[PDB]
Ligand binder design. Structure first.
Ligand SMILES: CC1CCN(C(=O)N[C@H](C)c2ccccc2)CC1
Ligand SMILES: CC1CCN(C(=O)N[C@H](C)c2ccccc2)CC1
Lengths: 193, 193
């Protein structure tokens, strides 16, 4: 039951490491999961729906990890606070590069993948903005740009820059330098006047 | 000759304002350009090739505008220098939103659109890095991050943030606030310690 479903998900994630969704068949997913094609269709309406679930799981893992941080402050300076938080996204999505890559491409063709991504981006921006506001309220950050607009650009930066590094795009920041690059831009743009 | 070619390009740009490339036919482009379908195929091998040329023209217009700036320094402070340069991209791509939107989507499916975009990104990053280096050499900017890695992230930020604003994505920075948002992040990240 949940075991066949999990096997289909594992197969799909494994197969997306070697080729795109377009080059993967339902027969490929069924075969890999040790089930027939009609049995597959009992668990999922389409290969597209398999990706959506994989992405949903990755996105929620990141979100849950950020919630955990938000509830248990690490005892460090402000630079390290931002780094720790950006690192949740670096590690979570960096641990699922094929799902990241396929899921970002699916945004063009799938309304549900677009809305999933859009919902969580709004959440992570809102949280970023709340932290900047608290930093301004405590007098640690200067009142420069509208917090929510600053939050939006920094989050979009992270999205495009992390994804380019993971995919090895040209151009991209090397994966071993991307965390420090983002953290510097967040800290200088948040604290700087 | 060049007139039929230009008419096909104009038709394609006009039609991309109302619908995507997938929903536009060669018969649509021929009709709009006042030519037959075989005559179309004399000028362009595909509707895809029409987009590639449109994007090529937009990209080169931006590039040429930046070259002009680079050769004639505006007499202002450093904030205004960056703003003027970011503004070339804001205005050029902002004046061709349908071509921008279609061309960015084509990156997934077209190797030539991917390589066009990649070539000019490398150029604009290299130029950004050269300016930061000169700023460091004159002692106006501190030696923080590797210039080229800083240049890469700021350019990727601009790409994703400008495009989200133009497309009205959720989330996005409002188009009337996006220039000031980017300029603040560039200036604080380039000059800040
Ligand atoms: C406290 C903040 C830390 C930094 N954040 C962050 O990088 N979000 C962006 C949008 C992202 C999300 C998933 C994958 C790649 C990038 C948000 C939350
Ligand atoms: C001096 C620099 C100014 C800012 N630049 C810039 O925004 N480039 C990015 C990559 C971009 C290009 C086209 C469309 C949207 C964004 C580069 C050059």
């Amino acid at each position: 039951g949940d075991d066949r479903e999990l096997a289909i998900l594992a197969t799909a994630e494994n197969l997306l490491e070697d080729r795109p969704l377009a080059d993967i068949s339902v027969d490929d997913l069924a075969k890999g999961a040790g089930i027939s094609r009609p049995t597959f269709y009992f668990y999922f309406p389409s290969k597209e729906a398999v990706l959506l679930t994989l992405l949903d799981r990755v996105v929620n893992q990141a979100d849950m990890a950020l919630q955990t941080l938000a509830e248990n402050p690490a005892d460090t300076d402000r630079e390290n606070m931002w780094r720790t938080g950006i690192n949740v996204f670096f590690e979570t999505f960096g641990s699922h590069k094929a799902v990241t890559r396929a899921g970002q491409a699916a945004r063009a063709t799938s309304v549900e993948v677009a809305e999933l991504w859009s919902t969580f981006m709004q959440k992570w921006i809102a949280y970023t903005a709340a932290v900047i506001d608290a930093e301004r309220d405590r007098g640690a950050a200067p009142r420069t740009l509208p917090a929510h607009e600053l939050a939006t650009a920094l989050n979009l930066m992270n999205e495009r820059t992390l994804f380019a590094s993971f995919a090895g795009e040209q151009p991209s920041v090397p994966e071993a330098r991307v965390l420090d690059t983002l953290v510097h831009i967040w800290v200088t743009s948040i604290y700087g006047e």
